[PDB]
Design a protein around this ligand. Structure first.
Ligand SMILES: [Mg+2]
Ligand SMILES: [Zn+2]
Ligand SMILES: [Zn+2]
Lengths: 52, 52, 1140, 497
């Protein structure tokens, strides 16, 4: 994970198996979709500067 | 390309000056600036000579 | 399922049936909410929901309802996949003429009623009114002024009506009927001269029979309702930055919707008659640009300045079905990494980076982890391989054990470009490729990204092991020469091991076994100069051969031990210098006599042996390596002095040519010859033993990287540079690259070399175009029948120039079944039977005695109905075994013809081959004689002597001399079309084959004759129908029609006869039966119209058809599966016949 | 001379054919006024139009629309808002009350004339005089009333429909009677003077042998069917012999008005061509802009009177500018931005340009919200509104290869990995449910749906097993807490992520 991007959206398509799994584990369906920037496959490693 | 943009601006000023009178007119009120900077933006944005 | 795709005219009723809602507003989505509009280019209730089972307005987004439609939005809940299949229609207020039929090479709309496109285009644009129902006011008068419309209408105000525009042309098409027009044109085509009118009458009758037979109405080219592409095809996805990325077709459809709405508002508003017709013209232009956009004024988008692409522009360029969509699919499960030499790997094993094997074998790794029990679930497995845990690497090496991966080099010119390798999880991030196999790939290791692919299926994973393996691709498909021959390093090592010198330590020291040589070499008693005797088994006669003490060398014994034990091979092959040509003949003889397993194992051993003996040899290039000839300064001075003796008095061109050809062009090989002679001499040291051979001379003689021209350019005179027009430089250029070139000579060198460098980048484009034409003309040439019932075959004669043979007859005839039994000259002894395979032994027996051309069965003489036969193509060029049914013979031949490209060359090499394959008339069209004996004079004052009939410009014959057929008046460059019109088809085939062979020999790339034979056969798939009755088609036609038409006419009686016509490779798709095969690479606006109005249905018989359609190819493993499907269908029919 | 260009073709017709009407605008306006006068005179006559306009006006004034739907308010006081509305209303009511008797007398006279024409007897004992006297009063009342065009449009539509039906019937009769030696132009002359007697085809056989053959076995049934259709249409609307000339003259007036409008449009289209040059490259082609402004130009002639400054130049240019700005704001952004939002964004960009010209550097988006006296949050959403969707076929590199359409990802295409977890989540759930009770596993599956996609609620899944109560919820909670141990929920602990 490089920069956690939290993007609000609508309710995803409620699938029965996923809903059953969520009810079993007690968690709630996250209304936000994962969009955090990640480093592509490479040997980058260290970070020099992070400008905002 | 700036000559082309200036020709476009001159056409715009000729089309706009017929409506707004020159007597008691706000200075540089009819001269536009969009096509002036738009030409250089296109020259440095997506021109084949300024590609990389 | 599905099969036999057929195209035709899109009926307005059928177009409305295809669509799901008429769009009446040019609005895609809302500016506030990104949702489809009610009626627009992007609709929910018209094209389906935008989300998977999520209806609009959040009413049925629970997926519980699948066929329920919304109430307020009216959109039926369905997955997003239906949004890509649901079509749409725009019921235009006025008709519109199709751009493909109105504006094109053949005016398909103009062919109706026999009206030229110049006036049909005027009557459509509302410029010149057309008259209908005449009754003064001639039919199709094409009047524009209102005088005859209103002033001439003062005859009672009755029976006066005429229309104009798209509606007028549609009514005109409706008035003309197909049956009556075809019947009228039939009598107009027969019983008359038909000199000039026949050219149009034939096309009109063809179009009428296509419309009548296919069932399409004539008034369907003009369409009142235009179908809209689904919204998923032209997307409007929100790009990163809030800027939507709308497809090109979206703007065109928006413009068409705007024009339609404007026309509807004008008609309902009762606008002026000049504005409504002008509105109809604008709508027609918009619909034209929306389909093709090329025949019109190239309407550009309002935002960008690039020419907007359309439904036709997509299919034309690479970005549609040509390259981007169907043929060149961006296949996943692939990988591109820079390649490195893999000499530690076997020939059937390519290095695969660990960082790439995980991303390539992710599903296979998941399957191995699930079956092994290491990972409980797929999500846990993905979480395991995503972090690259240490326990998954052991599973990666286990999954990649016998799973071959396709190694795809960037440029491919033949079937060996895609070779499957058993991957090895090597370190680093580069594909460790085998050194012997990269030569076949055309991939050096100076930077060459070899795209790696992974077959997913159990058959594809097994198909890559039986056919796509590197061990099975030893012999290149171009000819019977192994492509796994060592290119640079192994050949140099073998040459260093095989070079024998009389002076060296251990002279004639007999050794016991092979290991004795190495044991003595490690002790410093015997050198590696190959001058010591030892024991070795040659295995020449039948059965095992005794270990005879040969007088051979130690260096040639290290390579001799690697040779498999088999008769006809042994140390007798290694006795030569073992150059690149000799080593290729050795890998060819080991494969020609022994099996492929022993051949591949010998190639693997010799690569390791050559590598181990090349590094230990010290072949480094040095200053003294390239030895400048000491007898060079004197010869240069004498040449430059001879260039001045005749220059004193001076014609200037003659003196220049004497000073550039005989002065510098001549004696530049003399200096190069002297350099080669001084370099070949083995210098003997003071101790009686030669010091060493020059490394550059070793590389030049062994054939690894040297050559006479390169040697002269490096150390010789460097020759004379070229010019922009092609002339040779006249100034003296006396300096080699070992010496310092001044500014002028190096500038001339870079002026002459940049031309060849551009040819490597410009002529290669012509090579790619020729290869594309060949594979798409030879795609149908697929071996299907093993042995056909034909006996006649093409005659193969060993080509010879001057007094020597250019190619051996035993090599040209090798791998081809004979038609008739060849008879040895002198004595009437059958050296070869009639209909048996020509093995290497048979070829050697034939070449043992001087013989003329032998009757050889080729693909040209194939009497098979579909595809090519097996007893005619001969032997597959992959291995020594005969060709098997299912191989893409045409594709293999096209690749073999395209491989010599990028190094060929006007008429030099590549352009001449392109001209001969396309069958165009050369600049000097030759006219064949066809007359026997005396020849008379032509007509009186007709500008030329066309032809003289005696039944019983520049000219090269007399008026009373006895002329024989065959000698044609020309200064060169004959015409194949005339060759077929006058001479036989086999003669044209032989001419084309000899021309292509001469071109490839002048360039240096030997190509097998059968690879040109299949292309010539595919070029002869059309035959001009000269049938006087039962068929009015005189132009070219596919052979299947005479196979069927000529058989049907016999069941009704007039005898039918048709002479074969030869068309270029580009013109093969013009008259081919399949349209997908022709609409793939050819122009998509003419073949589709040639197939749409004709109702041509694609039976999926060819290879390119199934590739675009996605079904299994009818060639290869797909061919065998198709044969199995056919036999299973026959068995099912037989079973059904059992139970009535 | 094939131009192969719509713009050039449009220009050629306008130039080489149409001539600029110089000082003829007022003449075209007077011609349009004369056409409207002719149409009104043809409308206010003895037919269904006068009865429909009188009957419709009877309900208006008291309980129906008295003004703005029958008579134009401006036309009333034009020769003479709250005072003018009530003044014209009382006058219209008095006119209707005074003309009701005249309209009733005219309807009675029309019915008597229709009866006399259908029976055969000619009503000449002052019947025609009384009918004309009753019709003249209604015509004078309707002409001076200065009615609107709302009901006039419906009256003209009904008249055109009746005329089309009559023309079709006459054409059918002519085609049926002109087999041997009859024509089409004589049918009208025969029916104008032989329509009262029912045996028109039988009493018109004076001369000509073809007439007898056409009347006997040729068109004897066609003529009867046409007469029956005419008699049925007379009662439905206006009668015969009186509405024909009325609809003919009203159609002639409408045709003259349309011809004058078309002439004025063609004699001014050059104007639209000249005005469509400044809006070029604004989301619409040049010829598209011209043919769109033609809509506004035609809408301008519909409202073009002899007011001050009779020059139609200014009015035409204003209407073409309004039509181009009304259409450029819709079919230019590819998303159909509203007209008011287009004008708001134009005001915003003009303010930004004036600020760059006078104040200096580019102002912040939050400053533009207060610079125009609008909400701060509204200006933040005005900008960033997908101003111009980039073409998906644009080039991406130095050449025209690998356009942007080939590089756009897919946020809806289900990746094969995400489908793998779907299939395994279908397998990993069937295995965990195999350990529960059979009926309990069935009710739990019905609660969500493994095979059946109809996700039932608690009560719905309750009725399928037992009494729908909290027992189903209790067993569901027990099952949910059942597969939460490390043994059952082992392969799912790494499944939820
Ligand atoms: Mg390379
Ligand atoms: Zn809905
Ligand atoms: Zn054959």
């Amino acid at each position: 994970i490089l920069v956690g991007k939290v993007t609000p959206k609508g309710e995803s398509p409620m699938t029965p198996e996923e809903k059953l799994l969520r009810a079993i584990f007690g968690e709630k369906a996250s209304d936000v979709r994962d969009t955090s920037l990640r480093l592509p496959p490479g040997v980058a490693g260290t970070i020099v500067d992070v400008r905002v | 390309q700036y000559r082309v943009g200036l020709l476009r601006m001159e056409r715009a000023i000729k089309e706009r000056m017929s409506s707004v009178d020159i007597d008691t007119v706000m200075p540089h009120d009819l001269i536009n600036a969009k096509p002036a900077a738009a030409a250089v933006r296109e020259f440095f944005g997506s021109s084949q000579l300024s590609q990389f | 399922t599905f099969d036999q795709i057929r195209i035709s005219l899109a009926s307005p009723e059928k177009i409305r049936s295809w669509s799901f809602g008429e769009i009446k507003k040019p609005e895609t989505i809302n500016y506030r909410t990104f949702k489809p509009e009610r009626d627009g280019l992007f609709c929910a209730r018209i094209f389906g929901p935008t989300k998977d089972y999520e209806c609009l307005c959040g009413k049925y987004k629970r997926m519980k309802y699948k066929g329920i439609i919304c109430e307020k939005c009216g959109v039926e809940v369905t997955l997003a996949r239906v949004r890509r299949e649901r079509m749409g229609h725009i019921e235009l207020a006025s008709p519109v003429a199709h751009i493909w039929f109105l504006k094109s090479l053949p005016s398909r709309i103009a062919m109706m009623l026999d009206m030229p496109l110049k006036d049909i285009e005027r009557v459509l644009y509302f410029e010149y009114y057309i008259v209908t129902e005449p009754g003064p006011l001639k039919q199709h008068q094409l009047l524009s002024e209102d005088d005859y419309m209103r002033a001439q209408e003062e005859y009672g105000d009755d029976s006066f009506t005429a229309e104009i525009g798209a509606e007028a042309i549609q009514n005109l098409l409706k008035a003309i009927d197909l049956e009556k027009e075809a019947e009228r044109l039939r009598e107009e085509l027969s019983g008359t001269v038909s000199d000039m009118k026949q050219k149009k009458f034939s096309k009109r009758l063809k179009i009428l029979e296509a419309f009548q037979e296919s069932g399409n109405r004539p008034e369907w080219m003009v369409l009142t309702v235009v179908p809209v592409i689904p919204p998923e095809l032209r997307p409007l996805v929100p790009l990163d930055g809030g800027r939507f990325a709308t497809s090109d077709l979206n703007d065109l459809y928006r413009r068409v919707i705007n024009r339609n709405n404007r026309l509807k508002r004008l008609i309902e508003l009762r606008a002026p008659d000049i504005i409504i017709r002008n509105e109809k013209r604008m709508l027609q232009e918009s619909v034209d640009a929306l389909f093709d956009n090329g025949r019109r004024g190239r309407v550009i988008t309002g935002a960008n300045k690039r020419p907007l692409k359309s439904l036709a522009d997509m299919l034309k360029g690479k970005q549609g079905r040509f390259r981007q969509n169907l043929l060149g699919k961006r296949v996943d499960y692939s990988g591109r990494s820079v390649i490195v030499v893999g000499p530690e790997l076997k020939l059937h094993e390519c290095g695969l980076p660990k960082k790439m094997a995980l991303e390539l074998f992710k599903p296979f790794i998941y399957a191995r982890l699930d079956a092994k029990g290491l990972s409980g679930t797929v999500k846990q497995s993905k979480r395991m391989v995503e972090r690259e845990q240490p326990q998954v690497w052991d599973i990666l090496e286990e999954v990649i054990r016998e799973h071959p991966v396709l190694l795809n080099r960037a440029p491919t010119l033949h079937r060996l470009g895609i070779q499957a390798f058993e991957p090895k999880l090597i370190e680093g991030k580069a594909i460790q490729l085998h050194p012997l196999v990269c030569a076949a790939f055309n991939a050096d290791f100076d930077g060459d990204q070899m795209a790696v692919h992974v077959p997913l299926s159990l058959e594809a994973q097994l198909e890559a092991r039986v056919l796509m393996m590197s061990t099975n691709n030893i012999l290149s498909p171009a000819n019977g020469r192994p492509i796994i021959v060592p290119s640079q390093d192994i050949v140099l090592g073998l040459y260093y091991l095989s070079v024998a010198r009389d002076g060296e330590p251990g002279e004639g020291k007999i050794f016991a076994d092979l290991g004795e040589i190495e044991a003595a070499m490690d002790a410093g008693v015997v050198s590696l100069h190959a001058k010591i005797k030892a024991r070795h088994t040659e295995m020449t006669p039948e059965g095992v051969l005794l270990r005879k003490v040969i007088d051979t060398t130690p260096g040639r014994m290290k390579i001799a031990a690697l040779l498999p034990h088999h008769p006809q091979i042994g140390h007798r092959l290694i006795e030569k210098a073992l150059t690149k040509k000799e080593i290729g003949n050795l890998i060819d003889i080991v494969y020609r006599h022994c099996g492929q397993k022993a051949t591949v194992i010998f190639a693997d051993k010799v690569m390791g042996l050559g590598f181990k003996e090349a590094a230990k040899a010290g072949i480094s290039f040095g200053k003294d390596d390239i030895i400048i000839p000491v007898r060079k300064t004197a010869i240069v001075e004498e040449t430059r002095k001879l260039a001045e003796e005749y220059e004193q008095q001076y014609i200037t061109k003659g003196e220049k040519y004497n000073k550039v050809v005989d002065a510098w062009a001549k004696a530049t090989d003399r200096v190069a010859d002297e350099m080669m002679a001084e370099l070949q001499m083995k210098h003997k040291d003071e101790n009686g033993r030669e010091k060493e051979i020059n490394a550059i001379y070793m590389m030049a003689h062994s054939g690894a990287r040297g050559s006479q021209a390169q040697m002269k350019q490096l150390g010789g005179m460097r020759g004379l540079m070229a010019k922009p027009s092609g002339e040779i430089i006249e100034t003296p250029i006396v300096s080699n690259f070992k010496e310092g070139l001044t500014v002028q000579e190096y500038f001339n060198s870079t002026h002459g070399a940049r031309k060849g460098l551009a040819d490597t980048a410009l002529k290669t484009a012509n090579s790619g175009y020729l290869t594309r034409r060949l594979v798409d003309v030879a795609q149908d040439c697929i071996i299907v029948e093993e042995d056909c019932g034909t006996t006649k075959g093409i005659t193969l004669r060993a080509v010879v120039e001057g007094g020597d043979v250019l190619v051996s007859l035993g090599s040209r005839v090798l791998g081809r079944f004979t038609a008739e039994d060849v008879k040895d000259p002198g004595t009437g002894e059958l050296v070869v039977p009639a209909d048996t395979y020509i093995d290497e032994n048979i070829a050697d027996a034939i070449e043992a005695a001087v013989v003329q051309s032998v009757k050889v069965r080729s693909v040209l003489t194939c009497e098979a109905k579909i595809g090519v036969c097996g007893a005619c193509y001969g032997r597959d060029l992959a291995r020594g075994t005969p060709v098997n049914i299912g191989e893409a013979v045409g594709v293999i031949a096209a690749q073999s013809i395209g491989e010599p490209g990028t190094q060929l060359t006007i008429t030099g090499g590549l352009p001449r081959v392109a001209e001969l394959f396309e069958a165009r008339r050369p600049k000097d069209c030759a006219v064949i004689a066809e007359m026997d004996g005396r020849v008379e004079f032509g007509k009186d004052y007709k500008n030329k002597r066309r032809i003289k009939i005696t039944p019983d410009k520049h000219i090269a014959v007399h008026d009373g001399d006895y002329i024989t057929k065959g000698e044609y008046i020309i200064d060169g460059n004959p015409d194949p079309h005339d060759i077929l019109r006058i001479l036989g088809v086999e003669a044209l085939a032989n001419f084309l084959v000899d021309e292509i062979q001469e071109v490839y020999r002048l360039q240096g790339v030997p190509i097998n004759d059968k690879h040109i034979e299949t292309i010539v056969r595919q070029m002869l798939q059309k035959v001009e129908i000269l049938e006087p009755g039962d068929t009015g088609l005189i132009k070219g036609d596919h052979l299947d029609k005479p196979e069927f038409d000529k058989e049907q006419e016999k069941a009704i009686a007039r005898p039918a006869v048709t002479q074969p016509v030869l068309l270029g490779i580009t013109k093969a798709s013009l008259q081919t039966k399949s349209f997908i095969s022709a609409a793939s690479f050819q122009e998509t606006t003419r073949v589709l119209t040639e197939a749409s109005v004709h109702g041509k249905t694609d039976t999926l018989e060819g290879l390119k058809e199934n590739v675009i359609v996605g079904r299994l190819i009818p060639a290869g493993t797909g061919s065998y599966l198709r044969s199995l499907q056919r036999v299973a269908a026959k068995r099912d029919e037989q079973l059904a016949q059992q139970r009535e | 001379d094939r131009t192969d260009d719509p713009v050039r073709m449009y220009l050629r017709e306008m130039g080489s054919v149409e001539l600029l009407s110089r000082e003829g605008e007022i003449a075209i306006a007077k011609r349009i006024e004369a056409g409207r006068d002719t149409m009104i005179r043809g409308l206010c006559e003895s037919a269904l139009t006068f009865e429909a306009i009188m009957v419709w006006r009877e309900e208006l004034g008291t309980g129906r629309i008295l003004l703005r739907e029958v008579i134009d308010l401006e036309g009333t006081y034009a020769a003479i808002v709250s005072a003018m509305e009530g003044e014209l209303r009382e006058g219209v009511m008095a006119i209707l009350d005074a003309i009701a008797s005249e309209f009733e007398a005219f309807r009675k006279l029309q019915d008597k004339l229709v009866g006399s024409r259908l029976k055969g007897e000619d009503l000449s004992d002052a019947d025609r005089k009384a009918y004309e006297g009753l019709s003249a009063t209604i015509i004078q009342h309707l002409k001076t009333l200065k009615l609107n065009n709302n009901r006039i449009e419906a009256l003209v539509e009904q008249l055109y429909a009746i005329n089309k039906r009559l023309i079709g019937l006459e054409g059918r009769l002519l085609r049926l009677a002109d087999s041997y030696g009859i024509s089409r132009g004589e049918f009208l002359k025969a029916y104008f003077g032989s329509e009262l007697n029912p045996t028109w085809s039988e009493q018109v056989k004076a001369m000509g042998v073809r007439w007898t053959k056409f009347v006997e076995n040729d068109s004897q049934s066609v003529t009867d069917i046409r007469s029956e259709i005419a008699a049925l249409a007379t009662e439905t609307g206006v009668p015969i012999d009186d509405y024909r000339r009325i609809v003919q003259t009203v159609q002639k007036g409408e045709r003259e008005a349309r011809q004058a409008k078309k002439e004025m449009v063609e004699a001014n289209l050059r104007l639209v061509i000249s005005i469509a040059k400044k809006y070029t490259n604004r989301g619409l082609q040049f010829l598209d802009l011209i043919q769109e402004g033609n809509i506004g130009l035609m809408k301008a002639v519909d409202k073009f009177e002899y007011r001050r400054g009779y020059k139609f130049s200014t009015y035409a240019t204003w209407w073409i500018r309004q039509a181009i700005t009304r259409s450029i704001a819709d079919q230019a952004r590819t998303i159909r931005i509203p007209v008011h939002m287009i004008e708001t964004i134009n005001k915003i960009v003009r303010t930004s340009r004036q600020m760059l010209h006078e104040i200096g550097r580019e102002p912040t988006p939050e400053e533009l919200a207060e610079k125009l006296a609008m909400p701060l949050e509204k200006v933040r959403k005005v900008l960033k509104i997908a101003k111009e969707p980039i073409s998906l076929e644009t080039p991406i590199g130095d050449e025209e290869d690998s356009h942007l359409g080939d590089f756009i990802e897919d946020k809806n295409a289900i990746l094969p990995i995400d489908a793998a977890i779907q299939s395994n989540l279908r397998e990993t759930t069937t295995r965990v449910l195999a350990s529960l009770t059979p009926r309990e596993e069935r009710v739990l599956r019905m609660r969500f749906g493994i095979g059946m996609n109809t996700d039932h609620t608690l009560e719905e899944v309750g009725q399928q097993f037992s009494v729908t109560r909290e027992r189903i919820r209790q067993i569901e909670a027990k099952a949910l807490r059942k597969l939460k141990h490390p043994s059952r929920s082992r392969k799912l602990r790494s499944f939820l992520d």
